[PDB]
Design a protein around this motif. Structure first.
Motif, short mmCIF file in Angstrom:
data_model
loop_
_atom_site.label_atom_id
_atom_site.label_comp_id
_atom_site.label_asym_id
_atom_site.label_seq_id
_atom_site.Cartn_x
_atom_site.Cartn_y
_atom_site.Cartn_z
N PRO A 44 6.95 -8.48 25.54
CA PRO A 44 7.85 -7.45 26.07
C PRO A 44 8.80 -6.62 24.98
CG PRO A 44 7.36 -9.68 27.73
CD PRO A 44 6.78 -9.52 26.80
N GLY A 45 8.88 -5.69 25.32
CA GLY A 45 9.76 -4.84 25.17
C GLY A 45 9.37 -4.07 23.28
N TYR A 46 8.46 -4.87 23.27
CA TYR A 46 7.85 -5.04 21.27
C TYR A 46 7.17 -2.89 21.76
CZ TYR A 46 7.50 -5.31 16.25
OH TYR A 46 7.38 -5.51 14.84
N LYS A 47 6.45 -2.50 22.13
CA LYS A 47 5.58 -1.12 22.22
C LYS A 47 6.92 0.00 22.43
CE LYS A 47 1.65 1.41 23.82
NZ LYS A 47 2.14 2.67 24.23
N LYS A 48 7.52 -0.36 23.46
CA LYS A 48 9.17 1.22 23.64
C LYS A 48 9.75 0.51 22.26
CE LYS A 48 11.09 4.06 26.12
NZ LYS A 48 11.43 4.20 27.25
N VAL A 49 10.41 -0.29 22.31
CA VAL A 49 11.42 -0.31 21.34
C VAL A 49 11.39 -0.29 19.24
CG1 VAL A 49 12.90 -2.09 20.08
CG2 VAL A 49 12.62 -1.96 22.16
N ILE A 50 9.89 -1.50 18.99
CA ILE A 50 9.78 -0.28 18.21
C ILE A 50 8.60 0.92 17.48
CG2 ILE A 50 8.02 -2.13 15.52
CD1 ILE A 50 11.00 -2.18 16.56
N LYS A 51 8.74 1.86 16.98
CA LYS A 51 8.00 3.06 17.35
C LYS A 51 6.78 2.83 16.50
CE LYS A 51 11.30 4.27 20.21
NZ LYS A 51 10.71 4.41 22.25
N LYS A 52 7.24 2.59 14.92
CA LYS A 52 6.21 2.69 14.21
C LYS A 52 5.96 0.56 13.89
CE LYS A 52 6.40 4.92 11.37
NZ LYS A 52 5.87 7.04 9.97
N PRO A 53 5.19 0.22 14.91
CA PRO A 53 5.13 -1.25 14.36
C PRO A 53 4.09 -0.80 13.18
CG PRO A 53 4.05 -0.90 16.58
CD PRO A 53 4.60 0.91 15.71
N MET A 54 4.17 -1.86 12.34
CA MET A 54 3.18 -2.08 10.88
C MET A 54 2.76 -3.68 10.20
SD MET A 54 1.84 -0.68 8.75
CE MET A 54 1.66 0.63 9.15
N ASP A 55 1.90 -4.14 9.78
CA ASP A 55 1.63 -5.84 9.35
C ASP A 55 0.83 -5.62 8.12
OD1 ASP A 55 -0.80 -4.88 11.71
OD2 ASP A 55 -1.28 -6.92 9.87
N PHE A 56 0.72 -7.09 7.72
CA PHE A 56 0.09 -6.94 6.56
C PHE A 56 -1.07 -6.52 7.16
CE2 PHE A 56 3.78 -10.10 4.54
CZ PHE A 56 4.17 -9.38 4.89
N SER A 57 -1.65 -6.95 7.38
CA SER A 57 -3.66 -6.37 7.52
C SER A 57 -3.47 -5.33 7.70
CB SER A 57 -4.41 -7.23 9.24
OG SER A 57 -3.33 -6.76 10.14
N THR A 58 -2.48 -4.35 8.26
CA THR A 58 -2.78 -2.73 8.64
C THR A 58 -2.84 -2.53 7.66
OG1 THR A 58 -2.47 -2.65 10.99
CG2 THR A 58 -2.39 -0.64 9.73
N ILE A 59 -1.90 -3.24 6.75
CA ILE A 59 -1.28 -2.48 5.07
C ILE A 59 -2.42 -3.00 4.44
CG2 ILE A 59 0.15 -2.57 3.36
CD1 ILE A 59 3.08 -3.74 5.15
N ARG A 60 -3.08 -3.34 4.32
CA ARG A 60 -4.15 -4.45 3.97
C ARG A 60 -5.57 -3.25 3.95
NH1 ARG A 60 -5.63 -6.28 -1.06
NH2 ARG A 60 -4.68 -8.18 -0.37
N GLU A 61 -5.54 -2.88 5.46
CA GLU A 61 -6.98 -1.66 5.68
C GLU A 61 -6.35 -0.45 5.20
OE1 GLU A 61 -9.93 -2.64 6.89
OE2 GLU A 61 -10.43 -0.40 6.92
N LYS A 62 -5.48 -0.18 5.69
CA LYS A 62 -4.84 1.12 4.72
C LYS A 62 -5.04 1.51 3.73
CE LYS A 62 -1.73 4.03 6.48
NZ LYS A 62 -0.32 3.66 6.36
N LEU A 63 -4.65 0.24 2.22
CA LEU A 63 -5.10 -0.16 1.01
C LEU A 63 -6.29 0.15 0.48
CD1 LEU A 63 -3.09 -0.05 -1.14
CD2 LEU A 63 -3.47 -2.66 -1.51
N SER A 64 -7.37 -0.84 1.09
CA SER A 64 -8.08 -0.72 1.63
C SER A 64 -9.59 0.23 1.09
CB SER A 64 -9.28 -1.89 1.92
OG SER A 64 -8.75 -3.16 1.59
#
Length: 115
Positions: A44-64
Motif C-alpha cells: 500500500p501507498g507505493y504506486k501513488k507515492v513513488i512516481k518512478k520505481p527503480m530496482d537493480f534487476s530493472t537497471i540490469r535489464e536496461k544496461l544489457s
C-alpha cells in the motif's frame, strides 16, 4: 561549439565497467530491499507515492539491452533507487539503513572507477 571540441575521453569501457559496479551492488549483503521491483499490488501507498520505481534487476535489464545512452544516465537510475528508498522508509529501519549503506558503497565505487 561547431568544429570546437574538448579532447575525446575514452568511453569504450564504460558499459563493462558499469556492469561490474552493478554486480558488486547485486552481491552486497544489504542489497535485498533493492534486487527486485517493489510489488505494487502488495505494498500500500507505493504506486501513488513513488512516481518512478527503480530496482537493480530493472537497471540490469536496461544496461544489457542498450537503454543507457551514457554512464550518467546509469548513475541517475542507481541514485533513484536510493532516493525512492529514503522517500518511503524511515532512516531508523532495516530498509532505511540498507539504503544509506548502499548509496555510500555505490558513490565510492563510482568516484574510484571514473573520477
Amino acid at each position: 561549439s561547431m568544429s570546437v571540441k574538448k579532447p575525446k575521453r575514452d568511453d569504450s569501457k564504460d558499459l563493462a565497467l558499469c556492469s561490474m559496479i552493478l554486480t558488486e551492488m547485486e552481491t552486497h549483503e544489504d542489497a535485498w530491499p533493492f534486487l527486485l521491483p517493489v510489488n505494487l499490488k502488495l505494498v500500500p501507498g507505493y504506486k501513488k507515492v513513488i512516481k518512478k520505481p527503480m530496482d537493480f534487476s530493472t537497471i540490469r535489464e536496461k544496461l544489457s539491452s542498450g537503454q543507457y545512452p551514457n554512464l550518467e544516465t546509469f548513475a541517475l537510475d542507481v541514485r533513484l533507487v536510493f532516493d525512492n528508498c529514503e522517500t518511503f522508509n524511515e532512516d531508523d529501519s532495516d530498509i532505511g539503513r540498507a539504503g544509506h549503506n548502499m548509496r555510500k558503497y555505490f558513490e565510492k565505487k563510482w568516484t574510484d572507477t571514473f573520477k
